Scaffold this active site. Structure first.
Site, short mmCIF file in Angstrom:
data_model
loop_
_atom_site.label_atom_id
_atom_site.label_comp_id
_atom_site.label_asym_id
_atom_site.label_seq_id
_atom_site.Cartn_x
_atom_site.Cartn_y
_atom_site.Cartn_z
N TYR A 194 29.30 57.09 28.45
CA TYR A 194 28.03 57.74 28.27
C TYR A 194 26.99 57.19 29.21
O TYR A 194 27.01 56.02 29.56
CB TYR A 194 27.50 57.57 26.82
CG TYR A 194 28.13 58.49 25.81
CD1 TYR A 194 29.30 58.14 25.11
CD2 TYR A 194 27.58 59.74 25.54
CE1 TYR A 194 29.89 59.00 24.19
CE2 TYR A 194 28.15 60.59 24.60
CZ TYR A 194 29.30 60.21 23.91
OH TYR A 194 29.87 61.07 22.99
N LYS A 252 31.25 60.98 15.09
CA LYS A 252 30.20 61.63 14.38
C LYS A 252 29.91 63.05 14.98
O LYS A 252 28.74 63.35 15.25
CB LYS A 252 28.98 60.76 14.52
CG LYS A 252 27.94 60.91 13.48
CD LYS A 252 27.92 59.73 12.47
CE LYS A 252 27.09 60.24 11.31
NZ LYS A 252 26.74 59.24 10.28
N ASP A 312 31.76 57.64 8.80
CA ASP A 312 31.21 57.27 7.53
C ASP A 312 32.33 57.00 6.50
O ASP A 312 32.41 55.90 5.97
CB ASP A 312 30.29 58.35 6.95
CG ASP A 312 29.18 58.79 7.87
OD1 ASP A 312 29.17 58.45 9.07
OD2 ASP A 312 28.29 59.55 7.35
N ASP A 346 32.42 50.22 18.31
CA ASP A 346 32.11 48.79 18.22
C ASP A 346 31.81 48.39 16.76
O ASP A 346 31.99 47.21 16.40
CB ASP A 346 31.00 48.37 19.09
CG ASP A 346 31.37 48.43 20.59
OD1 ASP A 346 32.56 48.52 20.92
OD2 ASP A 346 30.44 48.35 21.39
N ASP A 349 34.33 45.47 14.93
CA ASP A 349 33.80 44.35 14.10
C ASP A 349 34.22 44.49 12.66
O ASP A 349 34.71 43.52 12.08
CB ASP A 349 32.29 44.20 14.20
CG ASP A 349 31.84 43.52 15.55
OD1 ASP A 349 32.69 42.93 16.23
OD2 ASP A 349 30.65 43.57 15.89
#
Ligand code: NA
Ligand code: NA
Ligand code: NA
Ligand code: NA
Lengths: 332, 332, 332, 332
Positions: B118, B163, B194, B218, B222
């Site tokens: 991006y 998303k 989500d 990311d 994590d």
């Protein structure tokens, strides 16, 4: 008298809302209820999920208690009843609570509802796609003030979760949150979502009022549900200027409607949020739930074989018992 | 002979990289190593975290093995050594593995490195902030092809997490991933981040090759670490056109440097990824680690009281033992 | 009775508006006028360029006749009176006319007023700047319908001038204009601004209703003035839903206020647009102006040495003369 | 020896370029010419408007002299020859000159070529359209330095024309132009395009080096042609790092090809720009043109009935005459 508009919806919505209303009536006679229809059947008969005259009465109510609505994949012209109510009533904030029923600890997650904060566009022009997102001071202040009042009310603080390292909108929002909180004497902690997810899994209960724009905050509000035995326990509120709508996070679950096994806890705890919102004794509902679950049989979504009614009665029994112990449950 | 460039870095980087290189030498004599300096000390002496002539030699190597680097908060003119190497070597993809050391299960998470996919801008003009994000077919194909080759190599499939419901860039990326995968006969599952977060906590090991643009990926990379006892076990690769750089996810941890307690597992498993990348026997390293941890004492970050050397020796011992059992560990 | 709100303004505004009102009274007794103050003096005394109670009366009027206002470079808290009126009255369209006084030919240029069509943001984040511009169907239709009604009223057509070759917003706007015009049976010609500028210099009078978003249309509306001997002849209208405000394009020219030499033609022709807007005999004003200028002395901005009053009287004389010739100037 | 690549093109391109080359040969023997084919015929035979080996020779030339090319409405796979050359040779700046042939006055207009300064995207997502435009310091400096060198070379100044009042990119560009000019001791005037158009019609010859991003600057470069009797007189240059391509603004005019009536002045004056670019005596060409047009018959686009050859010979005659008058036309 406070006037509460009740919108049971479809499927299990009516079942759980009956339980919630019965619970509210067990704690206070200071609320009376008016019921309204909404959903696909209303759309067929009038071209909108809810009648314009019912909306007008709802606008003038003090709070709304909402069950759940079934929204078909594609019914031309139809728009979700809950999306309509959020829009028409200007309910810009959503507050989800994941409760630890054993203890009374909670995870509180505040995000904006759809189009409550950001706007702009997304498009393809093949070979390339673009998204533009815009936030304003006025929109940022509005949700910040809400979360700040919520933290003040709880004697708490804000954990602002974001991606300010990548998105300037988040940096902007963070600065506004810090300004508003600073004015009100409310502590703000902030965290990048990536690492915060680890803390929400490992140490969920000690983050105060979590605030995040919904692009990230809706991640958190789902991730937080790993600490619930079932989605069926989880309440929420939708807040606007001068009115709020309370609803379980669970859906209409049409496939178990009529089986007498829907978990009523989410709706009942949504009623508890409603009472808090009106300055009434929501805590009595929470203490009653916690008491019931110590040894009480739960519905099948929580690994028990209770019927919905067993849980509704058992909670009301606890409320009764507390209300009778004048030395243990004193006023205010 | 394959030529591997070794860049130990700072703090615990040299300590763990010594272990990794010793492990690699225990499995194969088909690699030889050249070492290079990089970091703040090199910057002081030449104005760049790494010398331009060292970069040139590194570009011509077959793989890079990298430890960890300390990057000061603000050293004017300085730019992170690992960020420089990713940029200068065109390492557009990052693949993180969270291993289950008891079993050999893994969580594989592929995202782009910074500016790998991006672009666009973020800005305030007070009272309003904007972010614009742009993605192209060419950038989307490049990372899609990488993840698709990775899934093919593993006999696996892709879980594309996104998303797309909110961001058109994600919808665009999803479509390209589906096209590239379809060409190569690789299955694509897709999920909104989500809800996917719940699955990554509850059922982590069965998602194949997870691919997500880094804004969301990311988060996943994590969040996935909740299944690791320590970050010190976690390896990663950084992949470009014709070269790759392998490094532990952990940092330089200067406060424990010289204490002989740094976990070498992450670096050692990064070496195992390096061997796989060159077509060599990375699996022997993994089997040796798994064997060691059955009853082997671990470093303090995993609740044991081993020194780094105890773990490095114990792993090499397992490798030796396997290499001696000609009937149990056969070629290819 | 039509009710017209009169807002003379500052400097030469009162002078030219006196002439315009006297002219209107000479053609019709079907209008009566109410006067209102606005500008810096009103701001000093109430914190806004115009009083809120005066605005309310203005909103209910049938048309507004506006002179000109002096807006200081920086008077903290002050906002231009004409910008306020455009905003508060929802005057989304601006129509400028460059008249050829010898013949009655005209150049008609329609653009949106500020924020009447496009929105979005511009920002620097040093080393880079960005502009984002957004247009919607609803905004495009609104101005298209206006220009289309204006073309219909004139027995004319639309020349849509744009940069659709570069800007997608322009391509979008063009398509909407073509759709709306097609519905109403009104011809649309379109042209890229670059080449159109040559036609506007060389063949100005034969373009019908020119429509262009203001980014380009304001270029055209200034460029078109090369065909006027003075800016002092040029009228305009500002149109909204159910009300319009008419004003000369010229400014308040404080340095010639009180010298009796301001050109009243622009204001007088703005009155003629006002009468047309109310269905009254604006043409009588135009014919009277054209008659006066055949041999009439003009003000110094047009190379004559008339006073404002000489021109106002001479125009009123022509109107009188026409109104007396019952065979030559018949009703309707 | 300077080496000039000649690309005659189609239609009248070869005709006018023959005249230009003959003129150049009449002023200097310090240039030699190599010719190259390009256009649709080359595309049919090799899949690109120009051969890759011809491009390589062109890259190494000192200057390019280009005629004109016919580009079909839709020939699948085809890309305009002049667009290809601008791209492949990195010709980021376009300088157009409108000459006053009677006097030697000129209008100089500098803009970027396509994608020479701005980037970003435009898209519809129906009901809304968006355009995003991005500019960087590096791109702004590059074109600013060009225009600044051009002003220095002319003993002139820059008129920067823009819409900085609306577009932040323009404000940004203006600031960079002012910085670069300030460093070089070159005066910058600036003007909003809207009002500047009036000055370009009324007082065209006294604006120095006009610089405007092409969104507005291409308006100016067309509007300026109102001061030319024909587009056929107008030269231009396309400038990059270390090479430039000179071409008439006119097109290939296939419908008059072979009629012997194409105006050669534009191509000839483009040759004069080429000589200036190489440090040679372009002024001799201009003085020769001006001399010829005093009483010389011109081609039909200028209202005469000369053939192309009459004008080419008459210009060469003037050059000869000047070169013979050693006292009047001295070296340097
Ligand atoms: Na729900
Ligand atoms: Na690391
Ligand atoms: Na005016
Ligand atoms: Na040309």
């Amino acid at each position: 008298m406070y006037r509460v508009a009740v919108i049971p919806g479809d499927g299990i919505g009516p079942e759980v809302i009956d339980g919630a209303v019965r619970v509210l009536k067990a704690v206070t006679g200071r609320v009376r209820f008016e019921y309204y229809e909404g959903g696909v059947d209303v759309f067929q008969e009038c071209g909108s999920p809810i009648r314009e005259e019912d909306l007008e009465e709802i606008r003038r109510s003090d709070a709304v208690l909402f069950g759940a609505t079934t929204t078909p994949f594609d019914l031309p012209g139809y728009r979700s009843l809950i999306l309509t109510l959020r829009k028409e009533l200007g309910l810009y904030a959503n507050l989800r609570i994941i409760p630890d029923l054993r203890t009374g600890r909670e995870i509180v997650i505040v995000r904006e509802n759809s189009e409550g904060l950001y706007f702009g566009i997304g498009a393809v022009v093949n070979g390339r796609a673009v998204d533009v997102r815009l936030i304003t001071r006025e929109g940022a202040e509005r949700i910040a003030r809400f979360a700040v009042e919520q933290a003040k009310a709880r004697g708490s603080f804000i954990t602002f979760v974001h991606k300010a390292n990548v998105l300037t909108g988040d940096k902007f929002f963070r600065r506004i949150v810090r300004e508003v909180a600073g004015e009100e004497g409310v502590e703000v902690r902030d965290a990048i979502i990536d690492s915060f997810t680890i803390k929400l899994v490992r140490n969920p209960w000690e983050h105060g009022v979590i605030l995040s724009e919904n692009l990230f905050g809706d991640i958190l509000s789902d991730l937080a549900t790993v600490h619930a035995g079932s989605i069926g326990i989880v309440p929420s509120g939708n807040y606007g200027d001068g009115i709020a709508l309370f609803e379980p996070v669970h859906g209409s679950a049409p496939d178990i409607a009529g089986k007498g096994i829907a978990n009523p806890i989410g709706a009942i705890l949504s009623g508890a949020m409603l009472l808090d919102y009106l300055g009434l004794d929501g805590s009595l509902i929470r203490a009653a739930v916690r008491g019931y679950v110590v040894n009480g049989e739960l519905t099948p979504d929580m690994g028990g074989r209770a019927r919905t009614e067993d849980v509704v009665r058992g909670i009301i029994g606890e409320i009764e018992d507390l209300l009778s112990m004048d030395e243990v449950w004193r006023d205010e």
